[PDB]
Ligand binder design. Sequence first.
Ligand SMILES: Cc1cc2nc3c(=O)[nH]c(=O)nc-3n(C[C@H](O)[C@H](O)[C@H](O)COP(=O)(O)OP(=O)(O)OC[C@H]3O[C@@H](n4cnc5c(N)ncnc54)[C@H](O)[C@@H]3O)c2cc1C
Length: 434
Amino acid sequence: KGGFDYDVVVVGGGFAGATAARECGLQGYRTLLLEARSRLGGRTFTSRFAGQEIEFGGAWVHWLQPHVWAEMQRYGLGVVEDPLTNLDKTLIMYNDGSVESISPDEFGKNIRIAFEKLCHDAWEVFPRPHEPMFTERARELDKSSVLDRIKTLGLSRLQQAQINSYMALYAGETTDKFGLPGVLKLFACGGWNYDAFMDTETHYRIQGGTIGLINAMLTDSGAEVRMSVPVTAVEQVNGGVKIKTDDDEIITAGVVVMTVPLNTYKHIGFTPALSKGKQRFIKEGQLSKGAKLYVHVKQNLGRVFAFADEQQPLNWVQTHDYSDELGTILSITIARKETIDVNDRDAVTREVQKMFPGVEVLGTAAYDWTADPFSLGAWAAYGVGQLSRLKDLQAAEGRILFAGAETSNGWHANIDGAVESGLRAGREVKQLLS
Ligand SMILES: Cc1cc2nc3c(=O)[nH]c(=O)nc-3n(C[C@H](O)[C@H](O)[C@H](O)COP(=O)(O)OP(=O)(O)OC[C@H]3O[C@@H](n4cnc5c(N)ncnc54)[C@H](O)[C@@H]3O)c2cc1C
């Protein structure tokens, strides 16, 4: 349109990027997508362990999540139900390492009590969860951490350990740092209702894996897709942009959509400088230091669930599969990488054995999202005061647009939020290229 190599370049092949490329490709724009890694998905990654398909990152979807569910209808993708109902064993590991077996009914009842107390005012604070700063109350609450509220709730020891564990997981961090409104807003997105919100958590996966939806969008898009091309700089010039790759290739474009994780912006030079509000976000970054671990054990433990509080590593434990022949594959999410050397098998083994004494570890598979230069962190987790400034992160900068789950209004800790932001970006591109 103005002599550039491309109409639009999308940086990042996660869901935010795939969605944006799809929106732009179908408009008939000459569209390029650049991905730093040699694989697609970003903070979703479909892989294999002990002869079965697994998800190392984002995995779970629901019909109460509007953007991803519509995409699933478009591409004809069904759901797979993970065995999260009628549990056999439910455990809590407290800060000091002691393990308590709770009866599954009681376990469920207690986390319910604690969660409903934590999110008691979600309807008044977030009557419009897709406009987070609609009410003044949402703004004033952003002066508080989740821990500040937790301390006022009068929870039992069990209740407090369960909820702190849950929030540690959501934060990818200790709960003193974790912003209170973010959590409320999410609960609000799931119809301000415990049962509804829980059904969205870790229940339904995408049939064919996350990679299937990514491929379906990129295949639909007609965009050129380049793998193993990290972007190192963006300069605004001649009514478009010059994009520099790590090999010192220069690609010109009318517009660029940045979809990279917030914590990775420091790897990219911008000319001119981004706005001060945006520089603040980039220097703070996003909290989460999460990692993902699968352990195969010989013993058949059936359907298990465990919380560990934030001072212990194995914070969220769930059964991926079980049988007498298989044994059990445990799906474990770790809130803070620092709490466990996830690539040291002797350490992982001892930790698993602390949780389940007398278990025999047949194999492990891990993904350390904090060591990966193209994530440098896990899922989006807002610190105190970040949510109320979110517009700084979203705002167009001349011909640079921004997307990614961090920048979404709704389900910011989810695939759905990435999709949302990609739809926004597609629209902002059209407006610029119109
Ligand atoms: C361990 C883990 C588990 C999760 N589980 C769930 C879940 O169960 N359900 C759920 O809904 N959500 C989950 N999430 C979050 C969910 O994955 C995100 O909300 C969403 O998928 C992120 O999409 P994105 O496109 O914004 O980011 P990303 O997926 O991170 O995409 C960013 C892309 O940019 C690329 N990139 C980075 N730097 C450059 C560069 N310089 N040049 C080019 N490309 C670059 C990256 O390689 C990556 O492909 C999870 C996240 C993690 C980390």
